[PDB]
Symmetry: D2
């Protein structure tokens, strides 16, 4: 597990002891409750798990809200890829972010210096302050100044959603100093980026996108140090946003095919963005590749943003004229997905010739570049 | 039409399935849902994000906004409980968390909680993790403990693990303008319905009884449209969703609920009576002179499937009792297919001496679907081992 | 063990789970199973290919040889049926197919099958797809129809869809040296146990009652070690395996079987009595009802009337077709033992394109009583009958 | 689904109408029985499905043994990749082969001209004659002579198991003439080999290997013309070796990642066999891309992900090599996510002595999705331990 390449680590990660048990894949244990050997041993295991610690070997899991073996394997698998001490799995990416914010509030640090742009849900949860949080939206150059004596977390996302703007993680961690940094590494995945290497304390992942890879398993996981993992596990035990054994099995199963899926989707996206650049209907294409963020932080990407000349009307027509490419709000699936991010806020437009709002997000799937190029070209021509 | 609860448990939430050509609800694992139009999809997104239910003929947009499998399970329980709508979460604690978070954001962070309460619910209010201020009051101190900042009144009947009953008619009258949340996990919609008494929210830990087999984790609140909208808004941003597989098993479990509860309660009623005639046990706690205010018949149409045993030996006798059981499995849960046993005093105390404290002798027992002779013979053998 | 059937249904097949620290059996989807040693793995392969059960502490080798989830469900039903072992297949027809294939390879392709039999079982013997020769004999013609080439005697009680009872004590006595296969799908191990009467094989379509919710497809035969070995050999090469998910749901369904059967039978016993007092129906077919127990089989063979009812309508096929299409709560589908009440017209499977005719015969309607209230089921069926 | 490249066809194949229904993945319908609209329409659908025909749109599936929608989507998906008229899915690869043999017997053609080498199970099923079949084991050049007026099928497998010897499919179909040809395309998959293009009538696939791709879903499917697909569907309706909805969903899901998995596994295998050739312990390496007949390019667009190893030590060295692997798992299967190793000679021979016999030095290896450096370092360590 230490001398293995990431491709080998994705397949055998979290599969510890399975070869020895006589099985090929991890068993799906749906057990809500777990019987105990001795009242004394079961009571100790209850206190140990309720305090946020990891289940010691040879001890009963006690209850699924305290510990689930299926979830546990998926947690260790991602922690190995991200090179973090431990990982904590939740029902969704928003449930992991919710627990990270709730832990900061209870530790006496309700203030968060978030750096925009951020994912819609993360941006709205901080803005609402539903979990008793204070937010200070600062730019990349205003991080060190926006830090208060009450700050508990610095939430950053690279590449940004949906603009795909890169943020230098080496500068963020240096500006935060004593404050831990949470990096939403959903778009990059552990294949292309590892925020732990740059200095981030927490690495948020929406397992729904890329980690699952098929658009069927909902999930969220944070790869962080033992201290933060304990806080996150304490919140999970009382708030109960658990990952179902079936979801945990499909997310762990999806990690095995992650290296090959990302390598293929990134190759297709690199050619697709270059081919789409040679089009009169698109003014500019947004694809990673000025500070030399590539190589130092990211080893490409499978997402492309397209700014159209027609604005909202051309973007709306482009989304509805796609047949092979599916119009839905998600990413990292098996098929190519398309979405209009401006349409989520500007909805009852009623077909007006808007000058702006012409950005279209696109999540490259596992299809041939010729078929995706021909489909999107057909949709662009329909105007 | 006017359906009996037994029929309503089987066909509830199964609307349109006969017409679609299927026997059981399909398990749609889809994380994202494609949209017909950009304009129609955007409206469905705003409608679902604002906490409203998915209108027919509209895309679910995303699983965090709406899941069809979860939706069927929600309507099935709401019919069983006679509440306007229901909201399903990953666990019973996730439903309680969303109920507390909604109260805080509505400007009512204060909660007047009536003890005894379930371990997790009690610890969540004491910690104040969600920005809540608790005021632990007795049944007769409810109206006095209500502050101008109170948003919810959390009560639980029968209590855990003492099985003490609380008069829901008195609680709702004392709360007045403040909504009442009743944790009806032990009772289920078969024996008790807090909506008919005046409660605004009805919390259920679907893990116990609703699942009925000890394999599906869940939590659901049957409440009025206004409170369901607030709960749905919290679920959309906090994301403590119920997995399609979990939602299918919890809904499937509702069909066999009437027959399971009527059999487990019958076994429990005889088991508690047979355990009373034992030298080791000083007193048995089973609702069915246990009834003080005539709550059975008026609030509960049965004694339930839970029994609490007061042992004479104290902690040591309770510890050996749950360790000598072979057929009865020692675990921390209830409402499963098999009979479960637990020592509630052991979760806080781990002594190395002969202790006889009030509560140390209490043993919780969740009656399963086994024969009363086999359960009596196993527990009688474990008691003799001392 | 000294356990009552109700306790045995819940804890049966759950051996070692309490000790492992789990509440329910794990769902192991593993197609292949790694081996500890080449020598130990090779022995486990030969042992499982020869039709023997997996010895404890040995690799399952491959799913076609052994599946732990299926294994738990097999032992759970073998305990309820009091048979030595049990073999689980994809469907009830896959279990019957393996039973017929084993008989052919043992040099006994002849089967003395007594009618009436289930549609699929009857059609498989008539077609002779597996190289079998059938001899359809009545209950009193069993001993005479037995040839020196007979390998199995297939009987079904109650019959489908007439619900006619067959005396299993007379069948086993007439078969003598020939093993008897009894389809105990309609009765389940709760009300009937063919092993107690002398049957060698007990066929069950786990889809009906054993699953109990209409979601898991299955088939299992509770039989002696010799027939279980023959059956296990056919399953290893023909590969009609039970998927781990299906095996888990069928095993899970056994826990709630005692309470489901007692409730459905109670509802059926009252439903048939209330339906008898109706002008549209001429005769009701229910084992518990008076007139449907000729040899005193209630108590000796069946400890209940079951949850199936057959209705003889005065209008014939058209009254039966109108009755099926006028049901709203009761679902019209071809199956039994589900959570909800199902209705079907058995004559419609063969006499399908009857367009607005007034045929005198074929007025039988099969009904599988579910877990609903007797008042709601009576009110729905009484409304469908009035629609004529 | 016509002008698409195989990589695109693997992702969107069998996903017809899902985008229109508002879902991202096919729903898992576990329904054993299917309700009907009319008695007359339901009876016609029963006869249509029992006679081996595919379900017409807008008709009830009637029963799972007659039709399953989940299985149906997987059959559509594979048949598109194989360019065959229809496909029939069964519980296992052996269940598909069993139905193919049973259909031939009932059509009055119990004779099968099989060409050695064949897969263990397929070879043992023909030798036993359990389904009333008479086999005639003939070489590639003795096909036309071994054909009797009673022959119904010609079963061939390329590459052979475990030798990986290639068979010219153009010569087999020409020698069979009027007799349909069944090709076991398990190892090759529709990515590298297409038997329909060469003239084969039936294409057998063990969906357990490669089609699933993770070692969790058991399956078997035959891509064949409408006539043979009807005869196979008739056998499936009465013999009932059905594919469970969960298995069918995972096998269909696995088709989406098939192109990327086989391109990566084949690349790793092509380098691994070349690196293993430069080793003192191995006398010869068996890998298609290391070709005298010119079958690569004409029949196979790649060397595959399977490698056979001929060791100098015989049985002793092969057994030691299998037990000295730590990263590579010793199990009897192929096409999984991880690299698997097996000793084929050990299944029949369980000896005390060293036993240097022909085939005892052969080791089968199924290349997974790992790095070539990690697999070379592990196998080189296991060889040094021997
Ligand atoms: C919070 C709205 C849901 C948006 C969706 N998760 C996306 O990928 O755009
Ligand atoms: C993890 C809390 C333990 C209490 C447990 N949930 C029960 O119902 O007994
Ligand atoms: C073989 C015809 C199908 C009959 C159906 N399985 C039933 O039990 O009603
Ligand atoms: C154990 C002999 C069967 C061979 C095995 N199914 C494989 O594919 O290697």
């Amino acid at each position: 597990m230490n001398s293995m390449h990431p491709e080998t680590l994705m397949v055998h990660g979290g599969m510890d002891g399975l070869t020895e048990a006589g099985v090929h894949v991890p068993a799906i244990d749906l057990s809500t409750t777990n019987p105990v050997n001795d009242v004394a041993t079961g009571g100790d295991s209850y206190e140990w798990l309720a305090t946020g610690h990891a289940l010691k070997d040879g001890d009963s899991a006690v209850y699924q809200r305290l510990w689930q073996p299926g979830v546990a394997r998926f947690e260790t698998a991602l922690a190995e890829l991200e090179h973090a001490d431990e990982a904590v799995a939740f029902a969704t990416g928003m449930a992991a972010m919710t627990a990270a914010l709730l832990a900061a509030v209870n530790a006496g640090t309700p203030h968060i210096v978030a750096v925009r742009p951020l994912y819609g849900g993360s941006d709205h949860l901080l803005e609402t302050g539903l979990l008793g949080t204070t937010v200070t939206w600062a730019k990349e150059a205003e991080i060190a100044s926006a830090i208060q004596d009450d700050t508990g977390l610095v939430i950053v996302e690279t590449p940004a959603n949906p603009s795909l703007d890169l943020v230098d993680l080496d500068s963020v961690v240096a500006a935060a100093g004593t404050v831990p940094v949470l990096v939403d590494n959903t778009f990059c995945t552990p294949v292309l980026q590892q925020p732990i290497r740059h200095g981030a304390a927490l690495v948020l992942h929406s397992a729904t996108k890329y980690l699952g890879g098929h658009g069927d398993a909902m999930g969220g996981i944070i790869a962080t140090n033992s201290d933060w993992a304990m806080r996150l596990r304490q919140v999970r035990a009382i708030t109960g946003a658990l990952l179902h054994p079936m979801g945990a099995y499909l997310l762990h199963r999806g990690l095995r095919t992650l290296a090959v899926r990302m390598r293929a989707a990134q190759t297709t996206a690199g050619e697709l963005a270059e081919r789409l650049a040679a089009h009169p209907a698109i003014t500019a294409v947004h694809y990673p590749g000025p500070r030399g963020l590539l190589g130092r932080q990211m080893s490409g990407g499978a997402m492309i943003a397209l700014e159209l000349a027609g604005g909202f009307d051309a973007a709306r027509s482009f989304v509805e004229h796609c047949s092979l490419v599916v119009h839905a709000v998600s990413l990292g699936g098996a098929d190519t997905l398309i979405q209009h991010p401006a349409s989520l806020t500007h909805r009852p437009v009623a077909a007006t010739a808007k000058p702006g709002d012409g950005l279209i997000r696109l999540s490259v799937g596992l299809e041939h570049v010729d078929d995706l190029e021909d489909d999107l070209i057909a949709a662009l021509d329909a105007s």
